[PDB]
RNA sequence: CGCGGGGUGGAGCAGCCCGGUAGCUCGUCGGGCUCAUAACCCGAAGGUCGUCGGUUCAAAUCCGGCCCCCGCAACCA
RNA sequence: GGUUGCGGCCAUAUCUACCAGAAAGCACCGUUUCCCGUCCGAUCAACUGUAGUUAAGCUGGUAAGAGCCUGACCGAGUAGUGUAGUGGGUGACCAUACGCGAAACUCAGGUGCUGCAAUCU
RNA sequence: AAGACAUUGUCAGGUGGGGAGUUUGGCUGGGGCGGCACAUCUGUUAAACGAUAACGCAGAUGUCCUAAGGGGGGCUCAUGGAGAACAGAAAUCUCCAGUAGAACAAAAGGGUAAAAGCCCCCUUGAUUUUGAUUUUCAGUGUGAAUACAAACCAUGAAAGUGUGGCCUAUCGAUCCUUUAGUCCCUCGGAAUUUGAGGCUAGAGGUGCCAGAAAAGUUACCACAGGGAUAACUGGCUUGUGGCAGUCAAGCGUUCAUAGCGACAUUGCUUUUUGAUUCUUCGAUGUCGGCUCUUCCUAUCAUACCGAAGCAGAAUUCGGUAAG
RNA sequence: UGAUUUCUGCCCAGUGCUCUGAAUGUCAAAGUGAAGAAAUUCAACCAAGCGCGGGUAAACGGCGGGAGUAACUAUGACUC
RNA sequence: CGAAUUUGGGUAUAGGGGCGAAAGACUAAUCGAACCAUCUAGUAGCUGGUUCCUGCCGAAGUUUCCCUCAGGAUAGCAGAAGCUCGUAUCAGUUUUAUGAGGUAAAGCGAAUGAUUAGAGGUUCCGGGGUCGAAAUGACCUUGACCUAUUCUCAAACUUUAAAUAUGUAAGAAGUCCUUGUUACUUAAUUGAACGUGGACAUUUGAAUGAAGAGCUUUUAGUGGGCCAUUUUUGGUAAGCAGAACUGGCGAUGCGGGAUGAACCGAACGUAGAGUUAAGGUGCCGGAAUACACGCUCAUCAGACACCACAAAAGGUGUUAGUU
């Protein structure tokens, strides 16, 4: 798909509360930080003898991930996330569709 | 695999009509529905928003809510061994008033008129309706109507 | 070892044992699901009606 | 080689014609439906004899072709070709499926049994009812007996029970012989190449007059 | 130890929307060849398009007791 | 009664051919300065209603018109169908009893009615 | 002799079926192979409310789209006829006819003509909040969503329309991680910072799709059961195998049925093989042969006959007939 | 593998086994430097291994099609 | 049968270990992991059993989810305890009025798809023959194509369109004047909703019935079903497999079908009398070797549904029926 880099949408930023321009980016999962409680518990459970202690997924079926757009308001720098439907190809740069062109 | 969608097996049911395709006449939009009115559901295939389910196609309910372009209708649907009250947000194109309720209200007004007439003079109005009584005795004449005798006809191929 | 898949046999009899009796109706049905604008107006109108009725029969 | 019409006799299934879902059925064994002088006229051949069915069954295309060939051959042999017109009034449109099985050893181990038993077409048949006309022979009273015997032979070829009826209509039309006679002495009837054209009380009078000139000017 | 996708003739192929009213490669010492002669080559051409019966409106390309390539059994636990 | 504007029912209103239309009520126009829009004042926009036709859009009328509506003791109580039998029949199917009840065919009639407002020999 | 190196101890990486533990889906005309009928959608089975099965039939889904979403305006499409130099069956232009026979992302079914199709202009309502409602439903959840409410916008002159795609499919729990949001609450002796844990909404995924973390073999095998289920017989059926009729186009050197007999059609038979799973899995001893008795007739021979394309002699067809 | 006799043909692509390192490869603990107020990042022919290369079949093993071609025909010494 | 010989005794090797000229062999009748005791009364959705009587009520094999398919939860069916209330807000029923349907049927000179045959006019390309050296100067065909047309059809076609089923309503929570309130709505005391005052009795607004309406809690068993008559799918068919409605068997005896889970009657406390149902009345066997009219003679008669079989074809056997 193709999605514009700018988007006029509602901004609930305690100052805007109205439609406003947003810079559009794709949400990145971020680094899974050490010292999270779940990671600490997992490390404690994995330490020692006994082997693997929690399930490891293997039966992957989806060939697509849900693309989530993060919108940064140009007014108050407030961020809002919205997900889209599954799409194999995603694009932020906008090459506009040409209707009456050949080839 | 089996298919049970929202509009499954609704081909002919939601088929619009013969020579009644296209835009809808504006009487349907001009009709007025208030809370408590009994209305009939007949889905319009050319209108896709506010469409009722095929189960409620052909059912009759009571208006409980009124909105911009829609109406809330209450239908008792048999689920297992009981009726549950289902509330639908149908559109005026799919919805239509009830001639049965109109006739009953007309009969109520008439009945009140006859009761007022009875209070005026008391002529044994007999407010209630009665079923088809057996026909009483009558005398039928034969002048100009002498009985023409009929007999069974013999079989013939007629091909 | 296949088995019977589905049937509606005996279902209507089981329903009609103590079944298809109509649901009970009430005066003043629940005002949920109706337009909230109408709900606010009806609330204010009912308050005013109660006040006026008390004033009429003090 | 072919499974019997005893097995494929009765109207057990729904009509299953060759359509965009069948898309693969064999061609019928009977492709010709008119024999004799089909170019004749209702004036030429007055008498109609019908071979009709008294049963609600199916007749195979093969049986139809056999009866057709036998009746036509007998008629041509005995009375000559230019003495009759034979039209078969049933068309084989209901295809018949067959679930092919293995007649070998190890069949019980590599046959799969009744799983996936939907069959594929191997023949066609026509679904007749009680009183449906199967054969119609248009001929003369000098050939009445010959056409009756030919229809008897076709009956022998056909399954079930069939009757032979001397139709009271004029040939292949739908009008009784007095009625056709009166119209033809009048002018509401005028011959086409094979069938006949009829005058209508309604319609465009000038079109009728540029046609049907005899009735108006007679 | 069956039945079929096809037999044109000493070796093979039908515009399969079933009106086949006259197709392609072989022999041919004909043509030329520094071996009195060898490889090589425009062309006259035999088939009603497998011995026989029914479709037979003109038509032997559809059905049949001819062997085959193949698929799944010399049949019984 | 004609006509216009807004319509309701959406062919008894549509389609083909032809004939008629006083007076009122859209017209080719004079036009392109302005508003506006196109390759093209053809469509759309705009200003004059002035020299001018019933052209004919429109309306009405006519066709043993097509179609479309309305009926019928025409088809036909027929096809089908609910209920019943220790009914018939090898069966396929069929008849009967208590009820319901078609369509196609065949004839007959019709070919817009009407609401609001304005206007017209 | 060797020497701060070997060795020994601890931790870390690799190797390690030598060994240990465990697993190695389901449906299923027995299992296995195949397939997905496992989560879904269209039409039909489906028998005119709704519901309704089979490994039923014809198909389709896990995508695609900043436009193929939203609003407004203008035009009418597929085809066919006539006409215009190259130009012809098909290039562009112009009339006429054109109820849609076109197109609308896909599969099918609906739906749409001053549009829901084509083109042009603007645009992000594919936005926020949490309620109610329909569909499978237990009236639970997921998936879509019908109508509102409170805002903020888009579009249009305006009426209105818009909470993604004209509608019916196009999808995902706990735990964990991660991101956004008055930086709001907590770190429990008092605190400032870092860090961590919470509240409310998304994403990272479970296609066995209400969601286990998972390779085989056993003819050395074991246990609990099952005739809910296969391998015998028996039972229903007879496609198939076998046998027998009817009709007669033809074959029999002119001379249809002496003897055969195409096309078709009607049956019978449980000596074939299929189909089924009814009995038997706390056992009915399983192929063949040998031996022995009896029964059937659809008669090979023997008895007596009828018919021949019976001359005689062999033969062929048929009748009574299983002694 | 299985006396004697006569031989033990080709193939190291794959899976194994084995052998020194060219080093934009991968590269753990402990170590070394940045930053921070302190728990919270890179650099190291990084060690061995893996990967990249070389050997090895009396290691496990493997060891192919089609077509045209000769003076009856047939086959194909020959060729692609 | 002079040896890789046979053998006593003493020794060593001990259970995931030993030993094995190799058979998964032997290891105290135990070996594809000995024996002993304990953990241990191991677990078992799987078999088997589950002990007194009577009375009353009394099922289910179906919905959804589950590595779910021999099992559970869930809903449903059932019991018990009751609670609020006196001829009740009711009904597996009909009538009246008013909706919805696209199945049976029907139709194809109505749309789509399939399909037989002409005839008429064919000149916008196609084939050969005769006028035979000139194009739209002629005819027969394919038919770039209209009918008076014509024969058949459709589960995934349809204008039309039943029967049976199916949604509502038949009033007091109703019908008519005061608009009283409103922050909703209207140009507007205009509407919307709710309501105060007043009028309506033994026809309070169809029939029939009601065996007391209504309501709550809690829990058992069940979650293998099978069989008629109709509708109906796959299959040649099946005492086959799979669906719909209803009724049954399971769970149920009784009279009849000789015999039989389902068929026909009819359901059940203990007795008596009478009458019947279905089925029967020659004898078995209770009841007419009744009455009346015909038909049939079989050197395989026929004899009472489910049902325990028979066909096409043929016969001046015999009987009865247009010309």
From Swiss-Prot, chain A:
One of its GO terms (cellular component) is cytosolic large ribosomal subunit. The keyword Transcription does not apply. Gene3D superfamilies: 3.10.450.80. The modification N6-methyllysine is found at residues 39, 54. In wild-type cells, 78% of L42 is monomethylated at both Lys-39 and Lys-54, and 22% are a mixture of species with either residue monomethylated. PANTHER family: 60S RIBOSOMAL PROTEIN L36A/L44 (PTHR10369). Belongs to the eukaryotic ribosomal protein eL42 family. This is Large ribosomal subunit protein eL42A.
Swiss-Prot record, chain B:
PROSITE patterns: RIBOSOMAL_L21E. Keywords: Cytoplasm, Isopeptide bond, Ribonucleoprotein, Ribosomal protein, Ubl conjugation. It is found in: Cytoplasm. GO terms for molecular function: structural constituent of ribosome. InterPro entries: Ribosomal_eL21, Ribosomal_eL21_CS, Ribosomal_eL21_sf, Translation_prot_SH3-like_sf. Its main location: cytoplasm. Pfam families: Ribosomal_L21e. There is a cross-link at residue 31 (Glycyl lysine isopeptide (Lys-Gly) (interchain with G-Cter in ubiquitin)). One of its GO terms (cellular component) is cytosolic large ribosomal subunit. One of its GO terms (biological process) is cytoplasmic translation. Belongs to the eukaryotic ribosomal protein eL21 family. Component of the large ribosomal subunit (LSU). Mature yeast ribosomes consist of a small (40S) and a large (60S) subunit. The 40S small subunit contains 1 molecule of ribosomal RNA (18S rRNA) and 33 different proteins (encoded by 57 genes). The large 60S subunit contains 3 rRNA molecules (25S, 5.8S and 5S rRNA) and 46 different proteins (encoded by 81 genes). Component of the ribosome, a large ribonucleoprotein complex responsible for the synthesis of proteins in the cell. The small ribosomal subunit (SSU) binds messenger RNAs (mRNAs) and translates the encoded message by selecting cognate aminoacyl-transfer RNA (tRNA) molecules. The large subunit (LSU) contains the ribosomal catalytic site termed the peptidyl transferase center (PTC), which catalyzes the formation of peptide bonds, thereby polymerizing the amino acids delivered by tRNAs into a polypeptide chain.
From Swiss-Prot, chain C:
It is found in: Cytoplasm. Residues 1-25 have a biased composition (Basic residues). Signal peptide: none annotated. Residues 1-36 are annotated as: Disordered. Coiled coil: none annotated. GO terms for cellular component: cytoplasm; cytosol; cytosolic large ribosomal subunit. It comes from the Eukaryota. Its main location: cytoplasm. GO terms for molecular function: structural constituent of ribosome. GO terms for biological process: cytoplasmic translation. There is a cross-link at residue 51 (Glycyl lysine isopeptide (Lys-Gly) (interchain with G-Cter in ubiquitin)). The keyword rRNA-binding does not apply. Component of the large ribosomal subunit (LSU). Mature yeast ribosomes consist of a small (40S) and a large (60S) subunit. The 40S small subunit contains 1 molecule of ribosomal RNA (18S rRNA) and 33 different proteins (encoded by 57 genes). The large 60S subunit contains 3 rRNA molecules (25S, 5.8S and 5S rRNA) and 46 different proteins (encoded by 81 genes). Present with 51100 molecules/cell in log phase SD medium. Component of the ribosome, a large ribonucleoprotein complex responsible for the synthesis of proteins in the cell. The small ribosomal subunit (SSU) binds messenger RNAs (mRNAs) and translates the encoded message by selecting cognate aminoacyl-transfer RNA (tRNA) molecules. The large subunit (LSU) contains the ribosomal catalytic site termed the peptidyl transferase center (PTC), which catalyzes the formation of peptide bonds, thereby polymerizing the amino acids delivered by tRNAs into a polypeptide chain. Belongs to the eukaryotic ribosomal protein eL29 family. This is Large ribosomal subunit protein eL29. It comes from Saccharomyces cerevisiae (strain ATCC 204508 / S288c).
Curated annotation (Swiss-Prot), chain D:
Keywords: Cytoplasm, Isopeptide bond, Phosphoprotein, Repeat, Ribonucleoprotein, Ribosomal protein, Ubl conjugation. GO terms for molecular function: structural constituent of ribosome. Pfam families: Ribosomal_L16 (PF00252). Coiled coil: none annotated. Transmembrane segments: none annotated. The keyword NADP does not apply. InterPro entries: Ribosomal_uL16, Ribosomal_uL16_CS_euk_arc, Ribosomal_uL16_dom, Ribosomal_uL16_euk_arch, Ribosomal_uL16_sf. The keyword Ribonucleoprotein applies. GO terms for cellular component: cytoplasm; cytosol; cytosolic large ribosomal subunit. It comes from the Eukaryota. Residues 166-215 are annotated as: 2 X 15-17 AA approximate repeats. It is found in: Cytoplasm. The modification Phosphoserine is found at residues 142, 204. Component of the ribosome, a large ribonucleoprotein complex responsible for the synthesis of proteins in the cell. The small ribosomal subunit (SSU) binds messenger RNAs (mRNAs) and translates the encoded message by selecting cognate aminoacyl-transfer RNA (tRNA) molecules. The large subunit (LSU) contains the ribosomal catalytic site termed the peptidyl transferase center (PTC), which catalyzes the formation of peptide bonds, thereby polymerizing the amino acids delivered by tRNAs into a polypeptide chain. Belongs to the universal ribosomal protein uL16 family. This is Large ribosomal subunit protein uL16. It comes from Saccharomyces cerevisiae (strain ATCC 204508 / S288c). The lineage of its organism: Eukaryota, Fungi, Dikarya, Ascomycota, Saccharomycotina.
């Amino acid at each position: 798909v193709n999605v514009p880099k700018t988007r006029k949408t509602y901004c609930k930023g305690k100052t805007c509360r109205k439609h406003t321009q947003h810079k559009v980016t794709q949400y990145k999962a971020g680094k899974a930080s050490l010292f999270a409680q779940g990671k600490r518990r997992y490390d404690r459970k994995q330490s020692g003898f006994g082997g693997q202690t929690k399930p490891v997924f293997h039966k992957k079926a989806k060939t697509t991930k849900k693309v989530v757009l993060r919108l940064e308001c140009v007014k108050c720098k407030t961020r809002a996330q919205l997900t889209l439907k599954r799409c194999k190809h995603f694009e932020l740069g906008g090459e506009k569709k040409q209707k009456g062109q050949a080839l | 695999g089996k298919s049970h969608g929202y509009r499954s097996r609704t081909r002919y049911m939601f088929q619009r009509d013969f020579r009644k395709h296209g835009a809808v006449h504006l009487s349907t939009y001009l009709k007025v529905y208030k809370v408590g009115d009994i209305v009939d559901i007949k889905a319009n295939g050319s209108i896709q928003k506010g469409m009722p389910h095929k189960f409620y196609q052909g059912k009759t309910g009571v208006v409980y809510n009124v909105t911009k372009s829609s109406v809330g209708v209450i239908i008792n649907k048999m689920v297992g061994n009981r009726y549950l009250e289902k509330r639908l947000n149908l559109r005026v194109e799919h919805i239509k008033h009830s001639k049965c309720r109109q006739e009953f209200l007309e009969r109520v007004k008439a009945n009140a008129a006859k009761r007022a007439e009875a209070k005026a003079q008391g002529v044994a109005v007999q407010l209630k309706r009665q079923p088809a009584q057996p026909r009483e005795s009558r005398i039928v004449s034969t002048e100009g109507n002498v009985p023409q005798t009929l007999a069974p006809v013999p079989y013939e191929t007629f091909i | 070892a296949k088995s019977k898949n589905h049937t509606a046999h005996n279902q209507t009899r089981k329903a009609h044992r103590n079944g298809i009796k109509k649901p009970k109706t009430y005066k003043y049905p629940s005002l949920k699901g109706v337009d909230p604008k109408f709900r606010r107006n009806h609330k204010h109108a009912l308050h005013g009606t109660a006040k006026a009725l008390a004033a009429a029969k003090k | 080689a072919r499974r019997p019409a005893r097995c494929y006799r009765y109207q057990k299934n729904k009509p299953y014609p060759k359509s965009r879902y069948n898309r693969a059925v064999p061609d019928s064994k009977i492709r010709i439906y008119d024999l004799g002088k089909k170019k004749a006229t209702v004036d030429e051949f007055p008498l109609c004899v019908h071979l009709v069915s008294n049963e609600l069954e199916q007749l195979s295309s093969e049986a139809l072709e056999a009866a057709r060939i036998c009746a036509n051959k007998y008629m041509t042999t005995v009375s000559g070709r230019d003495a009759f017109h034979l039209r078969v009034r049933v068309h084989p449109f209901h295809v018949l499926r067959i679930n092919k099985m293995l007649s070998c050893a190890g069949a019980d181990r590599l046959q799969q049994g009744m799983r996936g038993a939907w069959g594929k077409p191997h023949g066609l048949a026509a679904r007749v009812d009680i009183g449906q006309i199967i054969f119609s022979v248009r001929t003369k009273d000098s050939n009445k007996d010959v056409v009756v015997e030919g229809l008897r032979r076709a009956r022998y070829k056909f399954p079930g029970q069939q009757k032979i009826i001397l139709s009271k209509k004029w040939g292949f039309t739908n009008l009784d012989r007095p009625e056709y006679l009166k119209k033809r002495e009048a002018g509401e009837v005028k011959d086409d190449g094979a069938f006949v054209k009829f005058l209508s009380k309604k319609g465009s009078l000038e079109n009728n007059i540029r046609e049907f000139p005899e009735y108006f000017a007679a």
